[PDB]
Design a protein around this ligand. Structure first.
Ligand SMILES: *C(=O)N1CCN(c2nc(-c3ccccc3)ns2)CC1
Ligand SMILES: *C(=O)N1CCN(c2nc(-c3ccccc3)ns2)CC1
Lengths: 535, 531
C-alpha cells in the first residue's frame, strides 16, 4: 500500500527527463551562450542585467535549469519539475526560484514524504508562489524534505535521500534540505523554506549559504502543507535562502508588497523599511559563546569568537548576553508546544507507512502510552535529565494545560525582551550548530536544535550567514569533545560532527520581533567583515 | 472571607472623597473659570487649545475630575481615583483619560470584581498606560466592570452596580460599562476598554458613544489583568472609547508611535496611516440587516436601513453581504474557544466568592460535570437547539481537540475573507445590539452577543457609532417581537429591550484585519451623514 512509493519515484524520474530534454533543446539553439559566467553572477547583478535587458529571461532560466539537473545527480534534491512555465515591472523579473516541497503548487504534490499525500495534487498556488510570479519570478523546482519535515536531516521513503554538496557522507540539514543542497551547489540563485525549529537555518549552515527566518506572521502561510494544523505556541516561519545576504534582502522587499497584503490580509502590511537595512550606524551587539545546553564544536566556538572580534574592530560594542532559562524554554515550552497532544495528530500521517531511519526513534517514543511516557521519565531522571524532561513534555494534555503553556510562552517572550531592553541591545550574536552531522545522525541528536528552536519559541527574526570553514585543527579537537550531559545526544553529536574538514561553519544573527530589516543589516555586516570579498 | 468587600468599598469611598477635596480646592482658586463651555468641547478642539496654551492642563483636569464626581453619583462608574511632568510635545498633552479597571496601574488594584484580587496592587503600569503618559495624557480614574468581565452587564459584589446615564433601570453595557457610563455623561473625553466578545461595542452602543475594537495585536496587551490567560483562539482586543470618531482616530495615532513599539516589540510597528483615514473616495460597503441568529429590534433595523440609505445617497455602492455559517462560528468556534477547558480555569476565580446576579446561571452551568453537560445537551436539542449547542461547546477538551478548533478558526477566517474579496468590499455595515437591556438581564440573554463576538472570532477591526435614538414607534413594535428560536434568550431579550424610548441606537462598522484607519474613515462617514 505504501509500497507504491515507486509511483512517486517514476514521477520524479519523468520530471528529471523533461528537464534534461528542455535544457538540451535550448543548448542546441544557443551554442554561444556562456554558462559559467552566467551562473557565477550574484543575484543583484543578475536581476539588473535582466531588468536592463542585457540578459533574456529564457537564457537565465535554462542555464539554471541546466545546473539544477547536474547538481541533482550528486545530491538528489529535486523532487519534481514545475512544468507549466513574466511581468516586466517586477523586482524579480527573470529570476528562477526553487521551492521547498511544502509550498503548494497547482497540479503538483506536496507529499511531505508520506504515502498518505501521494496521489493528491494541489488545486491552487499558495500566496507566496502567487506573489513571486506577480513579481516576475519563475518557480521551477520542488526540493526534497525529510519524511515528516520533523527532522534536521533530509530523507524519505518516497524520493530518497538528499546529500550535502560538500561531502557525500554528510547531511544537508533539514527540513529545507533539498533547498540547502541545491542553492549550495549553485543550482538556484534563490529559494524559499520553512522553519518551526531551525529548518531554514540548519540547511543554510550545513550547506554554507544564507537564510532568514522572519517573525512568524511577517509572511503569509496561506497554502502551506504541514503534518499538523492549529498549533500556534511554537511559531512557524517561512523565509528566503540564497548565496548572500543582499539576495535575502531583495527577496523580502519583493514579497513585502501590495500583492501580498491584498492576498491574505491577515499579514500586517509592513513594507520593507529600506532606511533601516541600508543603515551603517554602529550597533550594540549582544553575544554568547555557548547556550550551556548543547556544547559548541571547536569549529562553532572559533567562528563565534572571530566574528565577535571583527565586529569590535569595526566599531560595534559587544555585550555578553544569554537568554534566561533556556533549559526551560526547550524542554517544556518548545518540546511541549510542538507535542501538546503527545504527537497523536502527528502519528496520523504515519499510519500504514514506512518510517525513514533518519527519524530515529521519534515515532517509537511518541507511540508509547502517557503512563509509560511518565514511568520512563522519572526512571531516567537521576542519570539522564534531558531525556526525562523531553519524554515528559511529549505527553498528551488537556486544553486547560495548553492555555497554561501558551500563557507561559508569552510570559517567557516578555522576560527575554525585558532582559534585552535592560542591556539595551540592537541585535544578538549566537553560535549556529555546525559543521554538519553524518548522514543518518540528526534523528538521534535532538538536543542540538537548542540554538535554533529557542527563537521559534520566542518568535524573533533569526538569520544565518557562513563565516568560516572547518580547519583540520578544529576537527582534531572533536576528539576531546565531551558534552554537558554525557547522554546519548552528546555521544552521537561527538561522532557525527567528526571527519568534517573543509565544511562551512556559520553564525546566527537575532533581532527583536518585526525587525527583519535590522536583522539583515546585521547579517550584512557579518558577511562584509568575515567574507570581505564576496560580490 | 469574601465578606471583606467592605474593604474595597471604603477604599472606593476614600477615592471619591479625595476627588471631591481636590476639585473644591481648585474651584476656590479659579472662581472665574467656565466649566460648562470647557466640558462641551470636542477632544480635537480641546487638545489644540491645550497645545496652543489657551487652556492650562490644570484647568481641564479638575474640570473633568469635577464632572466625573458629579456623574458618578447617578451612575456608580468610578471604582478608584488614580500634570507636573506631562510632556509638552505629546499629541495628548493635557488630556485626562479614563481607564477600565483591568488596565494595571502602579499601586492600584485590578480587582476584576473578585475577592481573590482585593489586597493586590499593581507593581507597575501596563504598556498602554505608559505610552499615554509619555504622550502627555493623564489617566485619572479606574472605571467599573462586571464581576468577571464575562458579562455585557456591569455589576460586582465589591464596587456595586453601574447604571446607564440615560435611564437608571437600564444597563450601561459591559464589560467596559463604567467607561461607557462615564464618557456617555461627559465625565471623560476619552477612555480605554477591552473587547473579547463586544465589550467595547456594547457599552458604546448602550451609552451612545463611539468605540473601536482594533485587530487583536494592533495594540499592546502587556500588563492587562484577566481571569483566564493563554486563550488565543478568540482574540482579545483593546481600543479607545470617545464621544466622536475623530477622538478615536486621534487616540490611535497617539498610541501607534515609537514608544509603543519600543516597549513591547511584539506589536507590529504599523504607524497610523493618515492618507487612508483622511481619504474621501467612494466605498464599496457590504451590509446585512439581520444575522439570522439574534433578531434585530425595530430600533436596530431602522438604524441599519437609514444608514444604508444615506450612504447610498452619498455616492457609496451598497452590497448585500452576510458571513457564511454564523451559527457555526458562535456555537462551536466562539463558545468553544472561550470555554475549551469547560471553564475550569474561569471557575478558579470564584472559589469562595459571591456570584453577582448579573452573571445569571453561567457559574452554575459551567460547574456541571462534562457528562451531565452532554446529557442535558442532546436532551435540549429537539426543542432548544441554541441552548444545546452552547452547552456542548462549553465542555472540557484534549489539547488535540483545541488544535482542531484553532485550525477551524483560521480556516473560517480565510473563508469569510474569500467571501469578502469575491464581493470586492472595502468595509462592512452591521446591526449593533441595542437599545440597551434592563439592569439584570444581559446575563440571561447570551445569544445577543452574536453581532459582536463574530468579529473577535474573525479578528477584524470593528467599530460602533451612535446614529439614532429609540422613538416610541420603535418601542411599541417590541410587543410584536418574536425571536428566531423562541427559547429563553429570545423571551428575555423581548422584555429586556422594551420600555426604552429615547435611548441611543448604534450601528457597527467592520474592515479587514489591520485596516483600522479604513474602519475609522468609514465610521467618520456614518457619523457625518447620520449626525
Ligand atoms: C524545522 O523547522 N525543524 C524544527 C523541528 N526540528 C526538529 N524538532 C525535533 C523535536 C523532537 C522532539 C521534541 C521537540 C523537537 N526533532 S528535529 C526539525 C527541523
Ligand atoms: C466582552 O468582550 N465580553 C465578552 C463577551 N461577553 C460575554 N460572553 C458570554 C458567553 C457566555 C457563554 C458562552 C459564550 C459567551 N456571555 S457575556 C460579554 C463581555
Amino acid at each position: 500500500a505504501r509500497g507504491a512509493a515507486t509511483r512517486a519515484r517514476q514521477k520524479q524520474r519523468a520530471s528529471l527527463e523533461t528537464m534534461d530534454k528542455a535544457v538540451q533543446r535550448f543548448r542546441l539553439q544557443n551554442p554561444d551562450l556562456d554558462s559559467e559566467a552566467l551562473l557565477t553572477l550574484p543575484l543583484l547583478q543578475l536581476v539588473q542585467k535582466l531588468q536592463s535587458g542585457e540578459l533574456s529571461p529564457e537564457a537565465v532560466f535554462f542555464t539554471y535549469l541546466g545546473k539544477a539537473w547536474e547538481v541533482n545527480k550528486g545530491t538528489n534534491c529535486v523532487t519534481s519539475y514545475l512544468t507549466d512555465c513574466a511581468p516586466r515591472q517586477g523586482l524579480l523579473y527573470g529570476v528562477p526560484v526553487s521551492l521547498k516541497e511544502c509550498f503548494s503548487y497547482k497540479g503538483h504534490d506536496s507529499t511531505l514524504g508520506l504515502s498518505l499525500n501521494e496521489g493528491m495534487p494541489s488545486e491552487s498556488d499558495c500566496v507566496v508562489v502567487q506573489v513571486l510570479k506577480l513579481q516576475g519570478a519563475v518557480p521551477f523546482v520542488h526540493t526534497n524534505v525529510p519524511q515528516s519535515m520533523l527532522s534536521f536531516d533530509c530523507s524519505n521513503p518516497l524520493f530518497g535521500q538528499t546529500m550535502n554538496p560538500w561531502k557525500s557522507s554528510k547531511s544537508p540539514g533539514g527540513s529545507s534540505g533539498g533547498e540547502g543542497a541545491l542553492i549550495g551547489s549553485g543550482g538556484s540563485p534563490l529559494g524559499l523554506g520553512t522553519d518551526i525549529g531551525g529548518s531554514i537555518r540548519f540547511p543554510s549552515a550545513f550547506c554554507g549559504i544564507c537564510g532568514l527566518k522572519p517573525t512568524g506572521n511577517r509572511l503569509s502561510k496561506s497554502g502551506l502543507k504541514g503534518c499538523v494544523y492549529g498549533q500556534t505556541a511554537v511559531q512557524l516561519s517561512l523565509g528566503p535562502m540564497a548565496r548572500d545576504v543582499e539576495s535575502l534582502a531583495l527577496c523580502l522587499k519583493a514579497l513585502l508588497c501590495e500583492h501580498l497584503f491584498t492576498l491574505d490580509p491577515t499579514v500586517p502590511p509592513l513594507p520593507f523599511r529600506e532606511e533601516v537595512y541600508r543603515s551603517s550606524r554602529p550597533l550594540r551587539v549582544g553575544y554568547y559563546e555557548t547556550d550551556n545546553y548543547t556544547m559548541p564544536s571547536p569549529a562553532m566556538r572559533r567562528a563565534l569568537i572571530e566574528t565577535k572580534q571583527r565586529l569590535e574592530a569595526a566599531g560595534h560594542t559587544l555585550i555578553p548576553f544569554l537568554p534566561n532559562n533556556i533549559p526551560y524554554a526547550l524542554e517544556v515550552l518548545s518540546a511541549g508546544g510542538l507535542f501538546s497532544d503527545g504527537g497523536r495528530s502527528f502519528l496520523q500521517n504515519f499510519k500504514g507507512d514506512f518510517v525513514d531511519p533518519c527519524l530515529g526513534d521519534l515515532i517509537l517514543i511518541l507511540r508509547l502510552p502517557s503512563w509509560f511516557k511518565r514511568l520512563l521519565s522519572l526512571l531516567l531522571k537521576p542519570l539522564f535529565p534531558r531525556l526525562a524532561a523531553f519524554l515528559n513534555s511529549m505527553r498528551p494534555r488537556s486544553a486547560e494545560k495548553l492555555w497554561k503553556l501558551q500563557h507561559e510562552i508569552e510570559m517567557y517572550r516578555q522576560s527575554v525582551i525585558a532582559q534585552w531592553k535592560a542591556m539595551n541591545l540592537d541585535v544578538l550574536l549566537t553560535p549556529m550548530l555546525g559543521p554538519a552531522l553524518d548522514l543518518n545522525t540528526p534523528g538521534r541528536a535532538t538536543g542540538a536544535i537548542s540554538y535554533t528552536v529557542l527563537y521559534n519559541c520566542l518568535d524573533f527574526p533569526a538569520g544565518v550567514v557562513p563565516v568560516t570553514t572547518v580547519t583540520a585543527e578544529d576537527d582534531a579537537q572533536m576528539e576531546l569533545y565531551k558534552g554537558y550531559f554525557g547522554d546519548i545526544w552528546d555521544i552521537i553529536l561527538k561522532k557525527a560532527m567528526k571527519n568534517s574538514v573543509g565544511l562551512p561553519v556559520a553564525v546566527q544573527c537575532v533581532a527583536l520581533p518585526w525587525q527583519e530589516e535590522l536583522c539583515l543589516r546585521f547579517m550584512r555586516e557579518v558577511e562584509q567583515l568575515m567574507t570581505p570579498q564576496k560580490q
